Amino acid sequence: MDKFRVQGPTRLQGEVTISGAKNAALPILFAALLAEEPVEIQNVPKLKDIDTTMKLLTQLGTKVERXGSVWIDASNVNNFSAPYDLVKTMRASIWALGPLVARFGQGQVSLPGGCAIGARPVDLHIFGLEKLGAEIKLEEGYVKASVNGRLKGAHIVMDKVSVGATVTIMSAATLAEGTTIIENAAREPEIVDTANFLVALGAKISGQGTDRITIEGVERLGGGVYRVLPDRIETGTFLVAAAISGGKIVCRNAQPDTLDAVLAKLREAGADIETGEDWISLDMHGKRPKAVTVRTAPHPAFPTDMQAQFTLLNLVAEGTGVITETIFENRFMHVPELIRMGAHAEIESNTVICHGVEKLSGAQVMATDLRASASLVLAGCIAEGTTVVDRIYHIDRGYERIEDKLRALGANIERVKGE
Numbered sequence: 001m002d003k004f005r006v007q008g009p010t011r012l013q014g015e016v017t018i019s020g021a022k023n024a025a026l027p028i029l030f031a032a033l034l035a036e037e038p039v040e041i042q043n044v045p046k047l048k049d050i051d052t053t054m055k056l057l058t059q060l061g062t063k064v065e066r067x068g069s070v071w072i073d074a075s076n077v078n079n080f081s082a083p084y085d086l087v088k089t090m091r092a093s094i095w096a097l098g099p100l101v102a103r104f105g106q107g108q109v110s111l112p113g114g115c116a117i118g119a120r121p122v123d124l125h126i127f128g129l130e131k132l133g134a135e136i137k138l139e140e141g142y143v144k145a146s147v148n149g150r151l152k153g154a155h156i157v158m159d160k161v162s163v164g165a166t167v168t169i170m171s172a173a174t175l176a177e178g179t180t181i182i183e184n185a186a187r188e189p190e191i192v193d194t195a196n197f198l199v200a201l202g203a204k205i206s207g208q209g210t211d212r213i214t215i216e217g218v219e220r221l222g223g224g225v226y227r228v229l230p231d232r233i234e235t236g237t238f239l240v241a242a243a244i245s246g247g248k249i250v251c252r253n254a255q256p257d258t259l260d261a262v263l264a265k266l267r268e269a270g271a272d273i274e275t276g277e278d279w280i281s282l283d284m285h286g287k288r289p290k291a292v293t294v295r296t297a298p299h300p301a302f303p304t305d306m307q308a309q310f311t312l313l314n315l316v317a318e319g320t321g322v323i324t325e326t327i328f329e330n331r332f333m334h335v336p337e338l339i340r341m342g343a344h345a346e347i348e349s350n351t352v353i354c355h356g357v358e359k360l361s362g363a364q365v366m367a368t369d370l371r372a373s374a375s376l377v378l379a380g381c382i383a384e385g386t387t388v389v390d391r392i393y394h395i396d397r398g399y400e401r402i403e404d405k406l407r408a409l410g411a412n413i414e415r416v417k418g419e
């Protein structure tokens with residue numbers, strides 16, 4: 001398993017160019033199955049799931065090629081089944097179901113786990129398509145959807161916010177007969193970006209970004225060009241890299257409005273921040289950060305995806321801070337590892353009490369969550385000595401060339417292969 005051997009302490013500063021959000025590129029790529037004409041999706045990161053999605057689409061009869069853009073021609077999509085071998089590594093493959101049934105009246109996606117009484121993440125997608133008039137069933141290892149003719153617009157009330165089901169319902173709704181209204185819709189910028197992509201193809205959607213999205217079905221969608229938005233978590237991750245090392249940095253190709261709560265919190269930590277249309281700068285002016293208090297909640301509130309990074313910030317800040325998770329109350333895998341690096345923190349239920357220390361010490365660490373893993377790399381950058389972060393493939397799957405980006409900021413880092 002590959003590892004990153006990092007040597008500190010180092011000050012992280014300079015510039016970084018933010019990649020597009022894999023979490024917006026993915027739903028957009030499947031939404032492209034609706035387009036009857038060629039489409040160009042710009043600013044698509046080069047990550048495993050993107051390649052996995054490209055192969056899946058190709059297997060459906062889509063002409064697919066990529067570079068920084070991914071070009072799609074779904075004009076001749078003629079196979080409506082996504083097989084086990086092509087979906088096995090990716091849960092998001094369920095997003096092919098909605099577009100397929102909406103445009104072709106049929107679709108089937110290989111699903112692990114067979115039949116079950118207990119509620120599963122997949123069901124939300126299923127209930128959404130059922131509300132839209134599709135008949136669904138699980139058989140011979142597949143979830144199979146069909147509808148005679150067109151789907152039918154409906155007033156949907158979501159019991160709990162779900163990014164995945166919102167995408168499925170909104171995407172499929174664009175070709176439904178009549179109007180669809182999604183109450184308590186997911187508000188994430190990724191939903192906004194996906195809605196905007198559908199619109200650039202000719203769909204009628206309003207409300208994206210609020211708790212209610214309204215869609216007006218249309219006969220068909222055309223083609224076009226759309227640029228995926230910047231990855232806000234990668235952005236926050238680099239902002240934190242400078243914030244914790246007394247550095248200064250500028251993130252190019254960013255989008256400030258997707259990070260309101262994160263910026264406000266970085267200012268509370270003592271960061272001098274400026275922003276423009278598509279860039280963000282942060283300057284610590286050589287100072288240690290001030291501990292802050294954080295509460296994760298649904299977007300636009302503070303994101304759980306920035307929680308490990310901010311935990312790290314508090315752990316090297318002046319003062320005591322409290323991190324509270326209301327989205328995933330058990331996502332604190334990084335704490336014990338940062339404690340082995342010299343930190344001081346108590347985990348109390350769904351919160352972490354942090355007592356910032358002066359300097360961390362290198363150690364061998366590891367976390368299986370992408371964000372926590374990136375946080376351990378950042379900690380290694382500022383810790384005294386050598387740190388070895390193991391199982392970095394989690395990072396490789398969600399961050400584009402994080403190694404190069406950090407090296408350009410002054411990091412002393414190396415990938416170690418083999419054993």
Ligand SMILES: *[C@@H]1C(=O)C(O)=C(C)C(=O)[C@H]1O
Nearest residue numbers: 115116117136137138139
């Ligand atoms: C059980 C099953 O066999 C089936 O066809 C459906 C619709 C399910 O949700 C499974 O849990």
Ligand SMILES: [Ca+2]
Nearest residue numbers: 115116117118
């Ligand atoms: Ca079931």
Ligand SMILES: [Ca+2]
Nearest residue numbers: 115137138139
């Ligand atoms: Ca069945």
